[PDB]
């Protein structure tokens, strides 16, 4: 039970509710580019929103939704979402008790209210934009990241993939699965945790990522090292090993993880 709308619809609600500016991951900008065109849309939007019912007679907005926007514009602890699949879908997971999630498929913002039930209740919403593959199995290994980011920089500058995935601490059982992610039918997402308990707000230096390729779902959980560097494990896409792989990322923030 929720509701969807467009980017121009969404922004108008921020003007009557007073939430302000949306998170820029949603890319919800202002529709019109001159106050001379303001009345045209101040009158066309209130006209379209009463057709959906969420906007009452004159200017009153639906309370079940006016709550969903305030918690999104100014949250306390959020989780940026950026799905990629051949077309990009992106949203945010806000919390303020209640938790409201939003998604924008390049034209349609869709809000939805969730709960803080358990660490396992978040694996659907982070695996709904993917292709919903079953978790694969392979030999887990952890390679340095700042060197692993140099690998992808070669592939994109014209480099072969089979002669570089061996120049790592690569096993033999995991070369078939890492070869399927550099293909057409594959999708991934980048998760960035954020908190706003200061005069400013902060996000994480790195982020969690899951990939639904042909071989199956793949978890990619980073972890801090002793020298301040980042190393990431490539494990199976367990819907329960991800719930712990994320509170790790949230621990990097001065507000600590959300719940044990």
């Amino acid at each position: 039970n929720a509701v969807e709308l467009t980017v121009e619809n969404a922004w108008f609600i921020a003007e009557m509710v007073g939430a302000g500016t949306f998170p820029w991951v949603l890319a919800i900008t202002t529709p019109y580019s001159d106050e001379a065109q303001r009345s045209a849309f101040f009158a066309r939007q209130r006209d379209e929103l009463t057709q959906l019912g969420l906007l009452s007679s004159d200017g009153v907005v639906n309370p079940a939704v006016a709550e969903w926007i305030k918690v999104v514009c100014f949250p306390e602890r959020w989780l940026d979402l950026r799905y990629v699949g051949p077309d990009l879908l992106r949203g945010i997971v806000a919390q303020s008790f209640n938790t409201v999630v939003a998604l924008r498929n390049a034209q349609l913002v869709t809000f939805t209210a969730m709960d803080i039930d358990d660490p396992r209740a978040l694996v659907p919403v982070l695996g709904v934009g993917l292709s919903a593959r079953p978790p694969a199995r392979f030999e887990e290994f952890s390679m340095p990241m700042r060197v692993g980011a140099r690998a992808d920089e070669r592939l994109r500058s014209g480099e072969s993939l089979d002669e570089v995935l061996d120049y790592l601490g690569i096993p033999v059982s995991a070369r078939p699965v890492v070869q399927a992610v550099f293909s057409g039918p594959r999708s991934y997402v980048e998760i960035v945790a954020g908190c706003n308990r200061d005069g400013e707000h902060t996000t994480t230096d790195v982020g969690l990522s899951i990939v639904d390729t042909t071989a199956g779902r793949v978890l990619v959980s980073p972890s801090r090292a002793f020298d301040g560097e980042w190393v990431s494990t490539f494990s199976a896409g367990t819907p329960f090993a991800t719930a712990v792989a994320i509170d790790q990322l949230i621990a990097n923030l001065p507000d600590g993880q959300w719940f044990p």
């Binding site: 001159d34 990241m145 690998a151 994109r156 790195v206």
Partner: protein
């Protein structure tokens, strides 16, 4: 009419501003108002020194010089708001040059989007470096930088135009 700087991407803000004659037209007036202000003043001292050209018998009809002198006050107030306009123009010119150097380039914005497409192509190993996010976060930065610079250039140039 007064626009909104946020609805428009930085690509358009940088396009209008990057391409133009330049502030050289403003400074060409500043050095003409300041040249003009110096001649409004120089002629006031000649007017106040109008006497003495009456040789000996200053005597009769002194009403002649008595009627030209009052205009020396107009020449001083004219030399004032002239050198003020030279300051108004030179201010807007510096407002432009500093706003142009603070606007993100079209080529910068260009190189941003080409990086965003190749990240979509191949991004598996270096995926916890979150390049997709930091490349968009660099765009929204340029988005807000462009909108801020214009909002400030509107006020900086809106106050230099003011003249009581």
């Amino acid at each position: 009419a007064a626009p909104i700087w946020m609805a428009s991407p930085p690509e358009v803000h940088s396009a209008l501003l990057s391409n133009g004659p330049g502030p050289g037209s403003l400074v060409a007036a500043a050095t003409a108002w300041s040249q003009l202000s110096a001649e409004y003043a120089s002629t006031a001292a000649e007017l106040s020194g109008l006497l003495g050209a009456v040789p000996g018998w200053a005597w009769s009809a002194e009403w002649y010089v008595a009627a030209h002198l009052p205009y020396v006050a107009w020449l001083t107030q004219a030399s004032a708001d002239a050198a003020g306009a030279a300051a108004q123009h030179e201010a807007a010119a510096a407002a432009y040059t500093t706003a142009l150097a603070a606007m993100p380039t079209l080529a910068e914005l260009a190189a941003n989007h080409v990086i965003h497409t190749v990240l979509v192509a191949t991004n598996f190993f270096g995926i916890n470096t979150i390049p997709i996010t930091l490349n968009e976060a660099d765009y929204v930065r340029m988005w807000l930088q462009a909108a801020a610079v214009m909002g400030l250039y509107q006020a900086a140039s809106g106050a230099a135009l003011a003249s009581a």
